[PDB]
Design a protein around this ligand. Structure first.
Ligand SMILES: *O[C@@H]1[C@H](O)[C@@H](COP(=O)(O)OP(=O)(O)OC[C@H]2O[C@@H](n3cnc4c(N)ncnc43)[C@H](OP(=O)(O)O)[C@@H]2O)O[C@H]1N1C=CCC(C(N)=O)=C1
Ligand SMILES: *O[C@@H]1[C@H](O)[C@@H](COP(=O)(O)OP(=O)(O)OC[C@H]2O[C@@H](n3cnc4c(N)ncnc43)[C@H](OP(=O)(O)O)[C@@H]2O)O[C@H]1N1C=CCC(C(N)=O)=C1
Ligand SMILES: NC(=O)C1=CN([C@@H]2O[C@H](COP(=O)(O)OP(=O)(O)OC[C@H]3O[C@@H](n4cnc5c(N)ncnc54)[C@H](OP(=O)(O)O)[C@@H]3O)[C@@H](O)[C@H]2O)C=CC1
Ligand SMILES: NC(=O)C1=CN([C@@H]2O[C@H](COP(=O)(O)OP(=O)(O)OC[C@H]3O[C@@H](n4cnc5c(N)ncnc54)[C@H](OP(=O)(O)O)[C@@H]3O)[C@@H](O)[C@H]2O)C=CC1
Lengths: 334, 334, 334, 334
């Protein structure tokens, strides 16, 4: 119902497409800018080493893909401005290329005729960034460019918000043991980040995370109260956040968990979740929630220091939110 | 000079042997109880997917291995009591089989004629446990059974001790992102631990760690001040400890680091170390220190909450300490 | 309709259970001998790092598992003879423990009261071994113990049979690049096979394969015409067979492929398959056929030397056949 | 003694540098064109997830690296022509960038002032390609551009040559189970090769190999007698070639092996080798020979069909040859 165009048909680009494919009554993905090609587009959409073979009749239309029924125009141009958004009448552009995350760069879409742009990552500075289930209500239809934050910020914010509300977060540090991603090197090669420059499947790669300071955007009350690092490890998808926060009200794990289970059943039903099962990474693959609290691990040391371990499917979960946020955009005029 | 016998020729058993091989003027490894066989013993000692091919003339003596020069008797019997310790006159038994870690079980060696037993892990209860560079001086030659703690406890204790001395640890939680180990399953199989039961190279496996409470043994002042969890990840060796502790004296990362660098150059020269290099796992393989602080990551949030990230080669580093502790045993009579 | 009992609830044991769960109108799995426990049984059946979370209401019945509806008695005893087969009235025992593959060992089930025993592997000598789609018709209901061959023999036989029929296999060698399996070591440890003794996820492990000589059992005409090796590589499931055979009638790849496609649509519809898609391992996960020919790779060098590359999901595909063979057992009398 | 410049400081670029570092009395590497930077250059040269930390005092000279002693000018420009070869007086350019493999592209170095260019791969058509230990003697100092073939062609040629000489290769097919390389994707992304486009550490990736037809270049007698495919698997370095060839003279494995051992000790001492040890991948890391025959696996089926399995360290072994070939260039005139 809302004309959507996907710029960047990579991990999230393709996940997004598959995430709503199934969604019940969304917007309308009508175009795809895959630097690759029509061939590459349908092949990589039908086959996924992580998502599995796409259960859908994904074919080629001579010059655009076609899923069980629909034809999606496929275009290729790495210069956003030369894109048909205007001519086709694109309303929303899911900017998942990871190169146009600043007002300027993302603005290229706008000038190609696109109406809004939804950056599938952290916006660069002057950009409104929302996390569904935390601050999505502050969204204005007058927002020309949006940021759906990072995968880590989406997993972290929700239970943080709950933690702050019910116990009063004084300050804390989080560490994310995160799967490797396209940004890393398969084998020791050139990367701005000399740590990321190292073979991804062979090492545990320390690296900076913004998610900590990013939580403050979606939850102003935590401004300057958090910070952390990321540890990239030998797994394709599904990551885990390890949050240690010193709170205001004395507490115990069981109590913290219960708090998560209210919110999980209430204001975050669909965003936050609480698992009491002895699961591991894989078990969380293809989960639609932004964050799943691993109850069995919650620890409160010293009546004020709370440790929380939450899981997240950085690809699918996040793509689900991108779909969600887009839906909102749709519900708020254009 | 001190007759040593290795019970359990596995990862640490073989690492230990190779660790002192090179040591300059030790004790004397004269026997090896490898449930396997003479063949298996020299082959797995010469070839190591993690340590690399052993740079030494490792052969077979018909019924015992032989390294560049020496002949080590090889025996096989999973019932410690039926071992020749007595007859051969074994003084110290490096108990690295991981099954005899309680006073009773480890005691089997004693009754086979062995004098002392050095458990290559956490002792089970009634066992003196020492960490070189922390409490090794409390060692008594009247100690019939010793525990060299866990790999994680050895990496953690040293910088914790420093942290406590210089800033006063009030309480904290540590999380160890640790390589997989023989205890885990290659593919989903039976394990007491349903999380460890899952494929090791495919998931991030949450699991209980004792190291937290264990620090209290070697550093009494931290009794009941710590606790944490372990996260097993897809890497063969080299792990990392993520310690978050709330201290007494306000501080800043640079200051914490400096503190580590005094100790590193003083009382812990050889145990603790501080790296300012943007390294990753692999880079720490084959390091002789128990713990290397990753300076670039030290974070102090809220003037009292300190986050420390230290690396450790769970196989080699620990084996080095086992060699060290054995040497001590040697220096204290028998 | 046919009382089935699963001895050994491991990779195939669990796959088998899940393979028929879905089958349309089979036999009846009423018991499971899982050395583990009821807990371990349902947990490892519900969660699978390779198969994915089981889409079924898998619970615990106090002392037996329960799937979306059904209750399956769970028993534990590693001594087949002490099993209730008799008392419960077990007709068929899916021997997937991998330890009772000889007439004697497998015979234990019989003497516990079980009627037939279907070894989920290669039988040890004096055992009828059948491969569905090749020699299953030679099955006699008077067969007290069956062997469903290896996973590799099931992938190889079908297209070999076709190759022999249409071109006349003179002699050849096959090489299977196979995923690692429970039989291998996670890290350098003791194994009868010093190559398998090496870390599975770190090396390419050459190992002996019987599949070559095994084809001769199910296809007598190939007796002494084949032989090969196996190369275990860093992947959980899905393997590939590389068969090079010198034939009688001169040919060309496209012709060989057509031959496979002919049979694929006829006598082997459901056993053999031919993919023209540029797929890779993962893409073949959860395929019900015993063998999928990778058309794009077929090569005929010298008008008589034919190279074939076929894929197989060693866990699922094979389990599907085990279900199939059991069904047969069910159709020919009791 | 011969002014050498390295264009492309990647896997081979860095391996080459380290390969001769140790060589005894070579040529003289005086410059490095690393699109990266001086920083990146020394860091990635000192640290290697595969090669290990470089045992050498590798520092920064403000604007060029410096190894234990020496200063190597470091330059960055992806347009070969704008390189100082002329001004510095570069004699040989080790073209290891993998983008200038055709006469035209590689010719850019020449026109920047470089004398010869040694492509670290397969040359594109009109280029003399030599394999040390096979056809290096046909080298002319009037050769303006050289190709040191592929890593696979270097492993294959030597034992093929021997096979041809002693038994008469009629025709055959080879399959190489090769480690992943920079050319593959860490995660499903865009690649010309839709198979290589798939996650490297997750799948077994079939891919086309030239090595088969390439052998014909260095061994004219095999023109049109060979062909094969490659199967990229989840390992960083060290690959294996599986050659099946039908010969002229009837033979047996032990005889074939002896033939290899004969040459291994003679004309190929240093190029070919024969291992009787039950080793696996890792064990062959850092081997200086182009090819190591795995004796234990040699198979002769049908008195004429010979199967050979040889190992090769695609990074180090090949780099050793590149050093070797360069040395030759150095010995035949300028
Ligand atoms: O943080 C990331 C980032 O902001 C973004 C993309 O991440 P992804 O994980 O999908 O990575 P990728 O697989 O490399 O996808 C990037 C694609 O962009 C295409 N591309 C680059 N430049 C263009 C231009 N100019 N025009 C069209 N397409 C373009 C690339 O194509 P090529 O491969 O041909 O270079 C890639 O296809 O999403 C963020 N992210 C957020 C949450 C979760 C998450 C994850 N992977 O877990 C990533
Ligand atoms: O926490 C561990 C544990 O306490 C111990 C051993 O750990 P390791 O990592 O070496 O494991 P492994 O490779 O499985 O070695 C165990 C060997 O014991 C042999 N064995 C078992 N039972 C016997 C008996 N009864 N008699 C003789 N030998 C025996 C096993 O042989 P098999 O494989 O034939 O079963 C194994 O060979 O060390 C601790 N540890 C501490 C620090 C660091 C560390 C690491 N790996 O990082 C482990
Ligand atoms: N994996 C695959 O790809 C295929 C395997 N096979 C064959 O199937 C067999 C098993 O292989 P797989 O499932 O892969 O391996 P697993 O080790 O995963 O399964 C073997 C099971 O046997 C169980 N077990 C052992 N002894 C007993 C006993 N005495 N009583 C009850 N349970 C017992 C083991 O329990 P525990 O773990 O408690 O020791 C384990 O669960 C082998 O014959 C194998 O060659 C055939 C085709 C495919
Ligand atoms: N790896 C192996 O096993 C073997 C590889 N080879 C061959 O060697 C070549 C390179 O392979 P490999 O080292 O493996 O791969 P890498 O990608 O690791 O190396 C290629 C290098 O070329 C650099 N580069 C690209 N363009 C330029 C340029 N125009 N100017 C300066 N530097 C440039 C790249 O820099 P950047 O990363 O900044 O883009 C990269 O560092 C290929 O021909 C390959 O087939 C041969 C034998 C073995």
């Amino acid at each position: 119902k809302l004309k959507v165009a996907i710029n960047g048909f990579g991990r999230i680009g393709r996940n997004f497409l598959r995430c709503w494919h199934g969604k019940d009554s969304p917007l309308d993905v009508v175009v795809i800018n895959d630097t690759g090609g029509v061939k590459q587009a349908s092949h990589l959409l039908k086959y996924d080493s992580i998502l599995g073979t796409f259960d859908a009749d994904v074919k080629t239309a001579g010059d655009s893909a076609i899923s069980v029924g629909k034809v999606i125009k496929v275009v290729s141009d790495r210069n956003p401005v030369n894109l048909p958004w205007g001519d086709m009448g694109i309303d929303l552009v899911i900017e998942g290329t990871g190169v146009f995350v600043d007002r300027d760069g993302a603005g290229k879409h706008l000038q190609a005729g696109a109406k809004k742009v939804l950056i599938t990552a952290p916006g660069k500075g002057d950009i409104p960034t929302y996390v569904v289930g935390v601050n999505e209500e502050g969204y204005t239809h007058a927002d020309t460019i949006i940021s759906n934050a990072s995968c880590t910020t989406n997993c972290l914010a929700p239970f943080v918000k709950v933690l702050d509300q019910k116990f009063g977060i004084i300050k804390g540090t989080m560490t994310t043991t995160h799967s490797y991603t396209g940004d890393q090197r398969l084998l020791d090669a050139s990367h701005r980040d000399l740590r990321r420059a190292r073979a991804a499947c062979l090492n545990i790669v320390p690296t900076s995370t913004g998610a900590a300071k990013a939580v403050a955007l979606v939850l102003p009350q935590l401004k300057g109260k958090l910070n952390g690092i990321a540890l990239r490890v030998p797994t394709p998808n599904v990551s885990v956040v390890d949050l240690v926060v010193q709170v205001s009200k004395k507490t115990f794990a069981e109590e913290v968990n219960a708090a998560f289970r209210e919110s999980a059943d209430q204001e975050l039903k669909g965003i936050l979740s609480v698992c009491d099962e002895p699961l591991v990474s894989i078990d969380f693959r293809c989960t639609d929630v932004s964050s799943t609290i691993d109850s069995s691990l919650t620890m409160v040391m010293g009546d004020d220091m709370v440790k929380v371990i939450a899981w997240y499917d950085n690809e699918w979960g996040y793509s689900q939110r991108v779909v969600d946020l887009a839906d909102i955009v749709a519900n708020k005029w254009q």
